[PDB]
Amino acid sequence: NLQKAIDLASKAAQEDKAGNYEEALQLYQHAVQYFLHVVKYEAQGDKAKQSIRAKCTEYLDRAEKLKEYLKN
Amino acid sequence: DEEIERQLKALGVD
Numbered sequence: 848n849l850q851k852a853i854d855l856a857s858k859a860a861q862e863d864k865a866g867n868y869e870e871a872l873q874l875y876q877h878a879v880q881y882f883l884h885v886v887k888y889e890a891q892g893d894k895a896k897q898s899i900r901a902k903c904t905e906y907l908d909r910a911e912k913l914k915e916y917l918k919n
Numbered sequence: 920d921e922e923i924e925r926q927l928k929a930l931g932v933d
Contacts, residue, residue, distance in 0.1 A: 876931050883924055903923045910930055
């Protein structure tokens with residue numbers, strides 16, 4: 848599950864810089880979904896949760912932004 | 920965690 852979080856989170860951001868948005872938007876939500884998923888069923892410390900959390904916001908922000916700009 | 924978690928549920932919903 849973890850490998851999917853980064854694999855999905857990496858491909859998502861890779862598309863953001865490349866130019867893609869539709870595929871990056873879907874990957875963004877999916878990638879972030881795995882991040883919180885593992886955290887919900889695997890909480891070691893605060894440093895780990897603090898990292899995924901901060902990353903979940905940045906990625907989530909782009910998703911909501913692209914979805915808006917894409918429709919607007 | 921409450922804000923980030925809610926964000927996902929918001930974006931991912933149909």
